[PDB]
């Protein structure tokens, strides 16, 4: 049960942490239409986080989505390093979003065939949303990459700056592997072909270059984060830490 719980929790944390980042954009976007789109995506991802986290709490037999989101520290959080990256400029946000959306589409497509019915059901909902997210993120990848010289440079830099964290998208540990052998989880290594087919094509269509640096950064899944996560949780959890055990 512990492996299943940890796997579900990884997926929830991914969505939770990325949703947090998107929330920071509210009212700060280049256009009102973009403010709307980002709030929408962040709300979708938060809903997904609530689904996975709720399941993880049921699996563990204690707590709920709020104990999980607000009473774990940065060494217990198990999100991808990619989703905790700062928003930076709009291209940085778009690069991070596009890498994640392509991954979510590939993942949720296969995870809706899980032998675990709840994971299958959560993924069946999430995939419909992830498809909307990918259209938006790929659309902006193309607009910025194939816009002006300036936007083309920023989009390339954004891609380059995030690339090292893509390794973790295809990292498999013993939890991944054992559950994948039971037909429950997706072996992340087997996601690479579809993720690269999508992302390589998108980058090329945007008139940009696939970075040549071999991606090397992992650890998020084991609670070994960048120095970005701690300050995120400080902000996210403050009220719950000040006034624990209450209803809101």
């Amino acid at each position: 049960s512990n492996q299943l719980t940890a796997y579900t929790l990884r997926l929830g944390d991914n969505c939770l942490v990325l949703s947090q980042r998107l929330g920071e954009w509210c009212g700060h976007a280049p256009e009102l239409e973009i403010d709307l789109a980002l709030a929408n995506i962040g709300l979708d991802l938060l809903g997904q986080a609530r689904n996975f986290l709720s399941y993880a709490a049921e699996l563990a037999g204690e707590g709920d989505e709020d104990t999980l989101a607000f009473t774990r520290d940065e060494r217990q959080f198990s999100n991808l390093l990619l989703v905790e990256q700062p928003n930076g400029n709009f291209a940085d946000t778009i690069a991070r979003q596009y890498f994640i959306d392509a991954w979510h589409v590939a993942l949720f497509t296969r995870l809706m065939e899980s032998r675990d019915p709840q994971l299958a059901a959560i993924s069946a909902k999430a995939i419909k949303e992830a498809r909307y997210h990918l259209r938006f993120s790929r659309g902006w990848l193309e607009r910025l990459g194939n816009g002006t010289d300036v936007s083309g440079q920023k989009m390339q830099q954004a891609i380059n700056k995030l690339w090292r964290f893509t390794a973790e998208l295809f990292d498999a540990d013993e939890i991944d592997i054992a559950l994948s052998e039971e037909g429950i989880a997706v072996d992340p290594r087997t996601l690479r072909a579809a993720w690269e087919a999508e992302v390589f094509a998108g980058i090329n269509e945007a008139t940009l270059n696939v970075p040549q640096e071999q991606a090397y950064r992992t650890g998020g899944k084991k609670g070994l984060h960048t120095e970005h996560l701690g300050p995120m949780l400080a902000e996210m959890q403050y009220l719950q830490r000040v006034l624990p055990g209450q209803q809101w």
């Binding site: 929330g23 920023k154 006034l243």
Partner: protein, 304 residues
């Protein structure tokens, strides 16, 4: 003597025929609606900031999700209102710039800071409550596009306002600390909410024409009074107080009589000298300026 155009207009107003974008209208009617609908739209945009301020800090995932859905709807309402405003021949991009430059206004209430989570529930409950009274009252405004946009907006916002009240109810039923947080938020937002309705009927330059042309269907004071009568029982339900020593029920009239508004504060705030005016405008100016390369990217790409 009115012209035949002028006279026909007055008759259309009197018979409750909705004015549509192709109909003749007095130039001052066109301009006051560009002013009012545009600033209504500005208000949707700027109001995302005090609420957005707490999106990352909201105490539960449910309350966080509700707040995101709300703020998303506000962006949508801004868009409806700009659309409506443009049927009068203005450009969204031009009036937005005037907001950025301080040449147009947005609602006074968005110049107040969110200093606690309770402030978010209180904006949802009191502030949207006040917006709703004014907005339902504009569902019969004489200009069709404005009226129809009010209908659409009211359908959506009333739901969010109920969610705001429920968030307040949780605090009201929670720990002593939560109760105190709610009271303090009310103490700080009550009078600012009453000011959303505008100046007194004796001090309202637009009211004469607006009432005559049925843009405004109820006076500022009339709507404010309805809000007070409707909202006091809600404060009571929460077991909370109103920061108004002069508030009392007057059986002889059937209304709550309430204390005098600080009109000096009101005037300071609408003229850019409230608590967050500079920060609100700086945030929207920064978003516009930093987003320039993105908008220019979009335009360049669409052409190819």
């Amino acid at each position: 003597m009115r012209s035949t155009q002028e006279e026909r207009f007055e008759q259309r107003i009197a018979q409750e025929t909705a004015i549509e974008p192709q109909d003749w209208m007095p130039d001052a009617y066109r301009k006051t609606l560009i002013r009012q609908i545009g600033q209504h739209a500005h208000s949707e945009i700027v109001g995302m900031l005090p609420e957005g301020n707490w999106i990352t800090r909201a105490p539960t995932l449910r309350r966080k999700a509700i707040l995101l859905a709300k703020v998303q709807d506000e962006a949508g309402h801004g868009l409806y209102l700009y659309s409506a405003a443009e049927t009068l021949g203005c450009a969204r991009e031009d009036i937005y710039q005037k907001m950025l430059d301080g040449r147009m206004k947005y609602s006074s209430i968005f110049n107040y800071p969110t200093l606690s989570w309770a402030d978010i529930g209180v904006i949802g409950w009191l502030v949207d409550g006040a917006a709703i009274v004014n907005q339902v009252a504009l569902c019969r405004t004489s200009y069709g596009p404005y009226a129809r946009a009010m209908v659409k907006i009211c359908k959506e916002e009333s739901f969010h306002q109920r969610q705001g009240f429920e968030a307040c109810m949780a605090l009201a039923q929670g720990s002593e600390a939560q109760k105190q947080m709610l009271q303090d938020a009310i103490n700080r937002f009550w009078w600012p909410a009453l000011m959303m309705f505008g100046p007194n009927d004796d001090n309202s330059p637009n009211s004469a024409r607006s009432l005559t042309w049925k843009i405004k269907r109820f006076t500022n004071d009339e709507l404010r009074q309805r809000f007070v009568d409707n909202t006091v029982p809600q404060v009571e339900m929460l077991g909370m107080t109103v920061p108004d020593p002069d508030l009392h029920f007057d059986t002889e009239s059937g209304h709550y009589r309430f204390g005098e508004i600080d009109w000096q504060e009101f005037n300071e705030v609408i003229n850019g000298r409230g608590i967050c005016n500079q920060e609100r405008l700086d945030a929207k100016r920064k978003a516009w300026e930093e987003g320039t390369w993105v908008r220019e990217a979009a335009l360049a790409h669409a052409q190819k």
